[PDB]
Amino acid sequence: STGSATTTPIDSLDDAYITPVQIGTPAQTLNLDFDTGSSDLWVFSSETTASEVDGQTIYTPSKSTTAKLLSGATWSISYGDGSSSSGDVYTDTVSVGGLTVTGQAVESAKKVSSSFTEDSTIDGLLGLAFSTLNTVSPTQQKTFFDNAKASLDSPVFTADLGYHAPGTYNFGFIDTTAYTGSITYTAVSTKQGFWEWTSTGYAVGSGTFKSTSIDGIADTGTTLLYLPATVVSAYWAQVSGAKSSSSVGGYVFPCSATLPSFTFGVGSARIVIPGDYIDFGPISTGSSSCFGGIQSSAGIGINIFGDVALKAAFVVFNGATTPTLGFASK
């Protein structure tokens, strides 16, 4: 089997991407944030504290003839921005782009933090990291990909995120028309539960490439690119007026600037992030100070190849017995 679904930016800045997901019988379609940095599929639901729902579409398990309470199971998760959610668990039928999994754990939110409430466009998350990170207790549950894997034509999914435009998540096949040149594959460590890999270096604009190992995660659920302070300083030093602002919480730059590109290495290959991808717009409405899309990972504890980087590539998440990651230009 295979599946193919369009993923769409939630706003004009590509702050996140949503993908329609069918849950239950009859289908209830929710728009979920596909997140290769976590491993829980959770949804706003009829059980979510009413004051914490503001415009989201909810899953109502009592209206699904295939929903079954997973007795005794609870979940609770925190995210990189300090947002969180928790609740109980059902199993139900879940389909993404024509690909169906029966008995998928669907984690129903009883509580969500302010950040989720305030974002009316995201009805929940669909985790695509390794199932070892799944938070369901006392019996850990498998991700949608993990459940689908054996049925897929090939044990892979691909992320093709757009810049200010829709893109695609495919399951079970590699669309050879979706990228240019060849796909370069690179080793993955699953020891921390993430799609963790090592970039071979970077360049700023038309500058020379610096060969240096940068360990980080391929994370569709993170908006920006978080890299070591040395790398980030080198980038922003090429933008007149750019500075790190503690009050704003990162590098900012004059909105009148033309940003240089940023290149990252994948083995001997190179992915070029155009400068425009690094502009996240005014820090507040009407400001002429703009937020940068490359930020320091210092004090995160890990480097994160988020949407800013991933949207410059066609990315293969290869879930073979020994997982790997593939990157192609597009």
The number of beta carbons lying within 10 Å of the beta carbon of residue 297 is: 18
Q: Decide which of 174, 189, 220 is a domain's last residue.
A: 174
The whole-angstrom separation of Cα 17 and Cα 229 is 27
In this structure, are 211 and 296 located in the same domain?
Answer: yes
In this structure, are 303 and 280 located in the same domain?
Answer: yes
In this structure, are 187 and 168 located in the same domain?
Answer: no
Q: Decide which of 110, 143, 174 is a domain's last residue.
A: 174
| From 14, 33, 35, 92, active-site residue | 35
Q: Report the number of distinct structural domains present in the chain.
A: 2
Of 71, 194, 91, 193, nearest to 137 by C-alpha is 71
C-alpha triplet 18, 20, 25: angle, nearest 5°: 150
33 among known catalytic residues: no
Cα(first)–Cα(last) distance of the chain, in Å? 25
Pairing of strands 243-245, 250-254: antiparallel
In this structure, are 134 and 242 located in the same domain?
Answer: no
The whole-angstrom separation of Cα 116 and Cα 42 is 12
What resolution in angstrom units was achieved for this structure? 1.5
SS (H, E, C) the chain: CCEEEEEEECCCCCCCEEEEEEECCCCEEEEEEEECCCCCEEECECCCCHHHCCCCCCECHHHCCCCEEEEEEEEEEECCCCCEEEEEEEEEEEEECCEEEEEEEEEEEEEECHHHHHCCCCCEEEECCCHHHCCCECCCCCCHHHHHHHHCCCCEEEEECCCCCCEEEEECCCCCCCCCCCCEEEECECCCCCCEEEEEEEEECCCCCEEEEEEEEECCCCCCEEECHHHHHHHHCCCCCCEEECCCCEEEEECCCCCCCEEEEECCEEEEECHHHHEEEECCCCCCEEEECEEECCCCCCEEECHHHHCCCEEEEECCCCCEEEEECC
The whole-angstrom separation of Cα 219 and Cα 307 is 7
160 among known catalytic residues: no
Q: Decide which of 174, 191, 210 is a domain's last residue.
A: 174
In this structure, are 277 and 142 located in the same domain?
Answer: no
In this structure, are 170 and 302 located in the same domain?
Answer: no
The whole-angstrom separation of Cα 278 and Cα 280 is 6
Question: The CATH number of the domain where 320 resides is what?
Answer: 2.40.70.10
| From 199, 261, 296, 297, active-site residue | 199
Place of tokens 């969500």: 112
In this structure, are 184 and 149 located in the same domain?
Answer: no
Pairing of strands 225-227, 303-305: antiparallel
The whole-angstrom separation of Cα 154 and Cα 136 is 27
The number of beta carbons lying within 10 Å of the beta carbon of residue 86 is: 17
Contacts of residue 217, Cβ cutoff 8 Å, sequence gap at least 6: 36, 37, 194, 195, 196, 197, 302, 303, 304, 305
In this structure, are 147 and 192 located in the same domain?
Answer: no
Q: Experimental method for this entry?
A: X-ray
The whole-angstrom separation of Cα 6 and Cα 150 is 23
In this structure, are 187 and 315 located in the same domain?
Answer: yes
In this structure, are 122 and 14 located in the same domain?
Answer: yes
In this structure, are 120 and 146 located in the same domain?
Answer: yes
In this structure, are 155 and 181 located in the same domain?
Answer: no
Q: Yes or no: say if 278 and 238 are a contact pair by the CB < 8 Å rule.
A: no
Domain of residue 285 covers: 175-330
Q: Yes or no: say if 3 and 20 are a contact pair by the CB < 8 Å rule.
A: no
Place of tokens 């990157």: 327
